[PDB]
Amino acid sequence: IPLPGRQSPDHARAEAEQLAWPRSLGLIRSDAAAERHLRGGYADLASRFYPHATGADLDLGVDLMSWWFLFDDLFDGPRGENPEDTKQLTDQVAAALDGPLPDTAPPIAHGFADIWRRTCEGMTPAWCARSARHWRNYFDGYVDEAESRAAQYLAMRRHTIGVQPTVDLAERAGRFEVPHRVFDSAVMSAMLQIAVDVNLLLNDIASLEKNMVMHMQNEVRARLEQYLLLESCLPKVGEIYQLDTAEREALERYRTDAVRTVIRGSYDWHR
């Protein structure tokens, strides 16, 4: 992975204060759960996904990582092999995308609603709708993966790896938006799928002590070499979509602070 390792200069404060939010929303209710959370290194991970963020913007990134691993842990028991119970909980979470939640919603849903509320404030409505669809794609794929209990395994895990909502938050944490017509471009779509696949392959390698392996390094290498080719096309892609000066700068920030960070950030976090 020929991408520079980066970490937010405010990582120390964000890691020290990471527990206040999930405790405030009832996601962490015991000192043992707090210590188990601290052992995950989730603020550290967020500080590498979002090195361009500090302060409240970085805190939103930490909270997303915090929420996501707290969320995923709720499905590692009997409710994981139960597709109806999986969809039952994810529907209550994803309902936050459509409007206010009822007070009876479980804490994990109120946690997501607080993240989604913060994620959208200040962004264009079209960015919000597109980011909302990315969340629905994840939750739908999360249910589909529960219903299932190389080519077929990849098509399923590309939704549940959760790269796209992670990349989306880098835009919000950076207070920029890649031009929407470039996001939909075949070149950017190919760059994003590489980011999805590399995170997927690197995850199953690190999660082997417990799957794709059941050649992977060559696939990560070939995809990263193609990622650089696709990056070199971006100047011409910017011309094809007639980007002005600010749009070219937002596209550059997306390339360096959102796409590259989600590729390199997970690699450095695992190590």
Question: What layout of secondary structure does this protein have?
Answer:
Elements: H1 11-16, H2 20-24, H3 31-38, H4 42-49, H5 55-73, H6 83-94, H7 107-120, H8 125-147, H9 151-160, H10 163-174, H11 180-183, H12 186-206, H13 216-232, H14 234-240, H15 245-270
Helix pairs in contact: 4-5, 4-15, 5-7, 5-10, 6-7, 6-8, 8-9, 9-12, 10-15, 12-13, 12-15
Binding site for Mg(2+) 1: 72, 76
Motif (DDXXD motif): 72-76
EC number: 4.2.3.7
What's the Cα radius of gyration? 18 Å
Helices and strands, in N-to-C order? HHHHHHHHHHHHHHH
Overall outline: globular
Tell me the number of structural domains: 1
Q: N- to C-terminal separation?
A: 13 Å
Helix proportion: over 70%
| Strand coverage percent | under 5%
Largest sheet: none
Number of helices: 15
The computed structural class is: mainly alpha
Beta strands, count: 0
Family: Belongs to the terpene synthase family.
Binding site for Mg(2+) 2: 72, 76
GO molecular function: metal ion binding; pentalenene synthase activity
Organism: Streptomyces exfoliatus
What does this 3D model show about the protein?
- With 271 residues, this protein is mainly α.
- It has one domain.
- The chain is built from 15 helices and no strands.
- It has helices at 11-16, 20-24, 31-38, 42-49, 55-73, 83-94, 107-120, 125-147, 151-160, 163-174, 180-183, 186-206, 216-232, 234-240, 245-270.
- Helix 8 packs across helix 9.
- It is globular and about 50 Å long.
- It is classed as metal binding protein, lyase.
- Keywords: Terpene synthase, terpene synthase fold, sesquiterpene, fluoro analog, metal binding, metal binding protein, lyase.
- It forms a monomeric assembly.
